[PDB]
Amino acid sequence: FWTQLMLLLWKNFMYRRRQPVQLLVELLWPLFLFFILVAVRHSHPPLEHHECHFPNKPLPSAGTVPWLQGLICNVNNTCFPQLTPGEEPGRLSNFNDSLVSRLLADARTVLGGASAHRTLAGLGKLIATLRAAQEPLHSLLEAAEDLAQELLALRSLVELRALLQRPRGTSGPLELLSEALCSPACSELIGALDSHPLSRLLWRRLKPLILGKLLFAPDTPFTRKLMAQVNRTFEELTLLRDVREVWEMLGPRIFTFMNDSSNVAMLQRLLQMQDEGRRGRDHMEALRSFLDPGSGGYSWQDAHADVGHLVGTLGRVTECLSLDKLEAAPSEAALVSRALQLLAEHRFWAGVVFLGPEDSSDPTEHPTPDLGPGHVRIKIRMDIDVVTRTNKIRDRFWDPGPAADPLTDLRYVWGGFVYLQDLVERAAVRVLSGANPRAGLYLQQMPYPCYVDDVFLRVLSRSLPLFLTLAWIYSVTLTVKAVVREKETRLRDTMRAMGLSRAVLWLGWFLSCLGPFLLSAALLVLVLKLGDILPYSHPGVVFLFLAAFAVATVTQSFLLSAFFSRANLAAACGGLAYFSLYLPYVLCVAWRDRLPAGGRVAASLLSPVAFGFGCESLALLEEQGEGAQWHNVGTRPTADVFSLAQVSGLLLLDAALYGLATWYLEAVCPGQYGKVLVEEAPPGLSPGVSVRSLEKRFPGSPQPALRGLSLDFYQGHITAFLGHNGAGKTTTLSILSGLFPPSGGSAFILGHDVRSSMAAIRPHLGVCPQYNVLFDMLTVDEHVWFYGRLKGLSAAVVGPEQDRLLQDVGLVSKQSVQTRHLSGGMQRKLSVAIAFVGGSQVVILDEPTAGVDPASRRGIWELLLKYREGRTLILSTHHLDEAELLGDRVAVVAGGRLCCCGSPLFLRRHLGSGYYLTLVKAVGTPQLLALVQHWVPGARLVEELPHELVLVLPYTGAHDGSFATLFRELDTRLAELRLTGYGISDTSLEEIFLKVVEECWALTRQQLQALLLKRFLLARRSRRGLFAQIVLPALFVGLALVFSLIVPPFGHYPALRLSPTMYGAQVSFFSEDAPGDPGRARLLEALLQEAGLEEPPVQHSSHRFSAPEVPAEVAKVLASGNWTPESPSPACQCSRPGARRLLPDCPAAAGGPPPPQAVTGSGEVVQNLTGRNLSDFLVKTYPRLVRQGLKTKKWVNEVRYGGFSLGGRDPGLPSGQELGRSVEELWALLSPLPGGALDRVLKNLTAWAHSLDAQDSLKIWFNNKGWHSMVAFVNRASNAILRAHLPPGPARHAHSITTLNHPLNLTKEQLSEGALMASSVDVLVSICVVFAMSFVPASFTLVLIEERVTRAKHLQLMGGLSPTLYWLGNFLWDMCNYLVPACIVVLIFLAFQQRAYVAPANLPALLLLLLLYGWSITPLMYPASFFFSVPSTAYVVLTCINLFIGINGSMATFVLELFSDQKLQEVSRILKQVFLIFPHFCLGRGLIDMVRNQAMADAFERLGDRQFQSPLRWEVVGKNLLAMVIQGPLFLLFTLLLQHRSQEDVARERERVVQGATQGDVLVLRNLTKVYRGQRMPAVDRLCLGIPPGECFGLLGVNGAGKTSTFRMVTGDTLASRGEAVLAGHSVAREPSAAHLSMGYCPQSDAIFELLTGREHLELLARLRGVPEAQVAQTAGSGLARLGLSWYADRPAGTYSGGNKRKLATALALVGDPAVVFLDEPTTGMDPSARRFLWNSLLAVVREGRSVMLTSHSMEECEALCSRLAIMVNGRFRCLGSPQHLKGRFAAGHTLTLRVPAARSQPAAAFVAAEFPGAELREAHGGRLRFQLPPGGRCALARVFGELAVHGAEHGVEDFSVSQTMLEEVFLYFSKD
Ligand SMILES: *[C@@H]1O[C@H](CO)[C@@H](O[C@@H]2O[C@H](CO)[C@@H](O[C@@H]3O[C@H](CO)[C@@H](O)[C@H](O)[C@@H]3O)[C@H](O)[C@H]2NC(C)=O)[C@H](O)[C@H]1NC(C)=O
Ligand SMILES: *[C@@H]1O[C@H](CO)[C@@H](O[C@@H]2O[C@H](CO)[C@@H](O[C@@H]3O[C@H](CO)[C@@H](O)[C@H](O)[C@@H]3O)[C@H](O)[C@H]2NC(C)=O)[C@H](O)[C@H]1NC(C)=O
Ligand SMILES: *[C@@H]1O[C@H](CO)[C@@H](O[C@@H]2O[C@H](CO)[C@@H](O)[C@H](O)[C@H]2NC(C)=O)[C@H](O)[C@H]1NC(C)=O
Ligand SMILES: *[C@@H]1O[C@H](CO)[C@@H](O[C@@H]2O[C@H](CO)[C@@H](O)[C@H](O)[C@H]2NC(C)=O)[C@H](O)[C@H]1NC(C)=O
Ligand SMILES: *[C@@H]1O[C@H](CO)[C@@H](O)[C@H](O)[C@H]1NC(C)=O
Ligand SMILES: *[C@@H]1O[C@H](CO)[C@@H](O)[C@H](O)[C@H]1NC(C)=O
Incomplete structure (x- = not known):
């Protein structure tokens, strides 16, 4: 079992080692990609940021000085690592270091204790005046001394003085103002501001506030009262002019009383020293304070000068006050027009609309909440360049930052929106309530924890599988190609049938293809770990994951390799098929939140999806400060993610499923790869x-x-x-x-x-x-x-x-x-x-x-x-x-x-025709017949053709005596018979084999019509293919049009309602301090009611809030430590050196126990947080809320957005009541002016002093991630204030304020931006129609290539077919094929009513563009047909190149034209729009220009357009059309010129041809020479041949002789370097068309069309050869009848048998009656019946009177069919004569075979060698002998014949056979030697 296993492994290794180029490129392909990734990572290192805090921001409702102080100081928004004083519950302001606050405090604390002095002085003056109609002087002197001493102990006066006496260097006035805090004069101020960039940007931010113009549309007196209440603050502000003019009028009077009134003043001052002296050192110190003898000191002159200078500075500052920045407009449209006109000079600030509930002018909103008054709705309009956008609320991509950047995100502050909102809300609450509420509103931004910003992790998680797939695509393609190539050649079938099993082969393939994947995975893991891409992660887990993925992908490749059956087709399609399975991962990650958990496992069946999910899990676990390690292999990092173990299990399950599916599908092809006349009695009975x-x-x-x-x-x-x-x-x-x-x-x-x-x-x-x-x-x-x-x-x-x-x-x-x-x-x-x-x-x-x-x-x-x-x-x-x-x-x-x-002796060949006696001629048939009959009556006359005579000698009664006498008489007569030659051959086995087989201008018009019919039939026969390659590409974009408008079109920003409820369920604060006041309790109750809470009965109200239970361990931790409700939280860890974390994570004991909370009816949560920092708690508890939404990081929904703190009063000692008492005492008693010049000033000073109480404040904590939290919470606070101040009753429910936001509609530059610089849908449509239409032009080359690789085109050209007509017909048929998808797509545009393609002005542009696009794109694909040798790969390459060039050019020019910054981009795109050339790029530019001009027309027609914008203009699309239409025919011309780039008997016949040419001889050859290039020897050199047309010629030769070169030169395939070859008197060189018109060519190549049938080919050729239409059918009938074809009539020519191809080729050649018919190897391995039909047809055609030249390997046919043969070797003729003479001359002797039952050589060989002098022998075997008699025997063979008739008695012989020198004697000579 193992033996074949490692044999297969060794064979696979030997395959792999023999192609080093593939191995090297496979190894080095992913290394470059991961080097690019590593360089990208090295480009952007991660960043770290510490814990961050922000300062407070006041509002004008709180006051004037603090608001401007904040505006000046907190421009820069510097982050504070420590805590800020404003966040503590006690303090509110953090500007005790400020000079102004110290000055105000000093003034208050000094004037507080000076009431007694001034009152005593006043009463003394009044009593003195009354008595007019020394002790008061002493009292006044002591009071003045005390006041002078008090003012002496004031450093801030010294610092301000030292500031005053300074030059005007440094930067300017605002820098000095900032130092003290934290109109030509105005022109100089602006110049100084522009001198320094800091002051420049400060003034740029501040100017619109100073020089704005507020407006309001409604003009009812109600709005007038509102506007007066609004600008009351401006009225109060412009008071410094009054005091300025008061000082300017008072100063001269006291100055005149100062000098030249010196005697009197010296008199009183001299009076007042002795007043104290005779009643000390304190007095003269007071005297020195007055500086009455003031020369060294400086009080009076300097004091006057400095007071004047300060007043002048204040007046200069106030000179450029807006004074009157409030106007009115009658109508909203007039309001917008006036606002734009003001914007023309940079004067507009903001417009206000007092839309009334009764007006009912509410787009997509309720006209009014309820009947009755008490409802107010306000719109604010501002420039879009200031106010934040109003289309989306939350950011689409979460970032780990506090979002604190004044230029970018904080827009509501330097734009002044919040200021106007607060002022308008205060005015509205004042007018509606009827009272004067006081509430200082402050804004505070919540702190943010220390964090780490790194953009690489998210894109890594989103992009790693892409890199891996593009890395392994090459290996997948190579593996599938190798498997398919092996299975194509049936070698696997041989291995299986020869002893192997399927399992061994599958395991061998698996272990052969599992090597490089694991090597690549190991290298990738090493480079990832060492490249810092995935630090702090153990390589083993990643390596295991990659190995599992590799196993899954290799078994998936094996599964994919079970569909195709072609090598290159599989190689091309496998990569696309495998890559096409990665898109579902993108689709899933796009809709990550939408999909339920149930479908995740179902979608994870595909390997790339599972790998992507594992990768995102790995990245998410990596972001937590610890990479993949054995600690947390089986722990889910998040509630809705997968641990790596589950991913690996899913991968292995998928691998097993794929393997089982492949094993089952391997059986999709069962087996398919996609008369008793006998003898059984041999001498040796061995039934093996x-x-x-x-x-x-x-x-x-x-x-x-x-x-x-x-x-x-x-x-x-x-x-x-x-x-x-x-x-x-x-x-x-x-x-x-x-x-x-x-x-x-x-x-x-x-x-x-x-x-x-x-x-x-x-x-x-x-x-x-x-x-x-x-x-x-x-x-x-x-x-x-x-x-x-x-x-x-x-x-x-x-x-x-x-x-x-x-x-x-x-x-x-x-x-x-x-x-x-x-x-x-x-x-x-x-x-x-x-x-x-x-x-x-x-x-x-x-x-x-x-x-x-x-x-x-x-x-x-x-x-x-x-x-x-x-x-x-x-x-x-x-x-x-x-x-x-x-x-x-x-x-x-x-x-x-x-x-x-x-056995092949007579026991099987039972044929009546015993022997064939042939007689040749260089006289008389009757004499020979009479002689034969006299010698033996048995004789049959079968052949009587000229120059030969064949007779049949019956086998029965084979009395050799009579035949011997006949042949002896011939030997005594052949000398005078002039025959000089004859022979006797035995029965050939072919005839007996067959017998026993059945024993058991209008001309070219019709030519192009025929070509068009052929093309139409060829296209129509592939019904499914044509539909697939026509209907699908058009309907693809057709259905993609409707689904491509996902991205909304740009338009006006909608009007938005501002309210906290627009976010949903959330958590808020109502923290309170110093609750010792009924008003604060009322305000808190109003806040609670507004939050959505219902007042319960007191018994239930006692427990209206509930505290959540604390876990036991947290309580133990808190008790173990020393923690108070104010004391800091236990701890919270931070980012360690190296071990970075996204957010700090520390135990739940931090932040203290959960505060009590309640849930409202709207799902809101309120939390009661008094007694804490309320800052450290937020910092600690922030990440817990956000951690839930961190899985996807797309639309994060935080819970905490805002909160309220009811800071009451302010710890300090202003004591403004006694200040008011002092001011009113001064006003009433001293200098009462009836005109009010000083009285009104003193009145407003008293009002300010009495209003300095600042009964309460209110701080709003806001979260900036919510874009509109600030304004919503401000509105909520204002509504709560009005509710609190309103008396109880139904009106409380019926009174409310609504604030909206609606930017001004547009300007011109915003039009330029939002009309075309987005164009996402238009770009997608344009590129999609670019790709889809590009597939059709490359589809036409398939047919041309498949005809070119086959010799079908050549066979067609050997007809009467000119290349011009062929190319023109192909072009016209391509037009007809292309015409349909254009109609389909245009009808699709008409169906979807696309605006840009429906007007009467733009439709012709699209129509001509598409039609001429096809017209000029079809010929470009033609030249690619010659070079390529495989159709599918050529199609793929052409499609890829087309898509590449089109998309690259179009998108490059597009991205260059938009987002233009410098002039260099301007010129280049111009050239990129001038070079043209490419029709793809031309079509792209045309369509994109059409859509852009239509979009700009649509945008401009809403306004005043006054522009036709004709799509058909020359400079818009005209140039592209003209250039491409004029270049159209150039491709056809180039491809047609590329196609037409080509511009002894032997000696006696040689002499006969040289001396002259025969007119009858159709084929004449002279100087026949073919020289091969690089072979150092011509194939043929200086031959000649003259072929008469009445007989059939045969040519024979061995390989390398050059016969094929001669055939191709005569045909015209090979360039005629030299030599003359003329047919029918027409020269090939002088006129190749004439030579090829009448040539019937039949090669060995099966140049046939699978779809076309044989009768279709025959009819096509017939109509190409001028046959009348009616006679075509009968000609086809005759052509099929002469070859049969009854069963094959309707069958296609491709699905025939082996010999049917050659027989139909011969039929095609003979139809049309050519002058000469050439056949090359027409008989190679078919049924003998096909051979029978073939020789019948050729005898018919040669009898008809036409020349046929045949060349093949089997020359027995030629011996039996033709009458003239020639053998040629290496370009030199050898025989070139009549076939019988050829055997007689060179083939020489004769052979004899003997069959003896005894099988003893000697008894036969004795008299065999005795009969003839020669003793040649070969293959001496008992079964058969071979004796070569002396060649060229003068006497007849009768010398043995009759002798044989006796020797049958001498020895027992089965039979004797004689081979009398046939043509294959040369093959016998070759076999012997
Ligand atoms: C509210 O909680 C905060 C802590 O979140 C309390 O303020 C913290 O007070 C400690 C005590 O000084 C500060 O520690 C200091 O850290 C610096 C760092 O270099 C170190 O040099 C000092 O020696 C000291 O250890 C800590 O910085 C400070 N927190 C912040 C953010 O600055 C605060 O007391 C709590 N409020 C109360 C108790 O009312
Ligand atoms: C900025 O956008 C607003 C809102 O679209 C524009 O106001 C609109 O102006 C058009 C005039 O061009 C108004 O059309 C008129 O409609 C009435 C029917 O209400 C019809 O009788 C008139 O013959 C005319 O067609 C349109 O009503 C008005 N409002 C809306 C909601 O469309 C505004 O004009 C734009 N800015 C500029 C500078 O044009
Ligand atoms: C507040 O608005 C009112 C009316 O809208 C202003 O009243 C007039 O203002 C102009 C210029 O400001 C004066 O010339 C008129 O004498 C004012 N008339 C009355 C009846 O008051 C008022 O001035 C505005 N406040 C400020 C500071 O400009
Ligand atoms: C505060 O100063 C103003 C002068 O700026 C005093 O006079 C008022 O001036 C405004 C316009 O500037 C008028 O609309 C008012 O009618 C004037 N009188 C009043 C009572 O407002 C104003 O009197 C001073 N304030 C007090 C309380 O006397
Ligand atoms: C604003 O703060 C930045 C960052 O600390 C600092 O570089 C810059 O000088 C500051 N500019 C002004 C005008 O305060
Ligand atoms: C005041 O009067 C004196 C008298 O000699 C004169 O010299 C001086 O210029 C006047 N003005 C001031 C500001 O002293």
């Missing part, structure tokens, strides 16, 4: 081979293939078997061997049945089929070694058998060369010798001389002479002339039944 009434019945044929055969064979005799094809000979051979079991009868061989003995009869059996059994890569030595080893011979003595056989076959010199496919013809003798290696007693041969050269034929025959002893041999060969030489006994079968059998 015997069959007794065998029976078998094939399923296809109801009649049994072979009937009962009771004949038995005998050892020691070379028995011969004769029969017809399909007459049971093949069935008998199959049954005798092990191919099929014996169905009936007995087949006992050597006493044991073949079926009973099984393998025990193999050691002594010999089978040699007609098909060769050889291996191309091996050589003869290992061939015989392998065969001897497999047959069971011991390897010890295999060497002697090997060398003995190789020396016996005479291949000693040719075995050391070690070449198999480098030799031809010789291999037959080696193949037949292989059957003799085992020394089997019984050997079977089937056609051992099928096509071998005669010069070696005797060779193999000699081998049979070497093994004619001690062995039984049974040969079954169709021919007869070889059978007689080796025939000890002969058996005959006919119709699956034995007819006769016996």
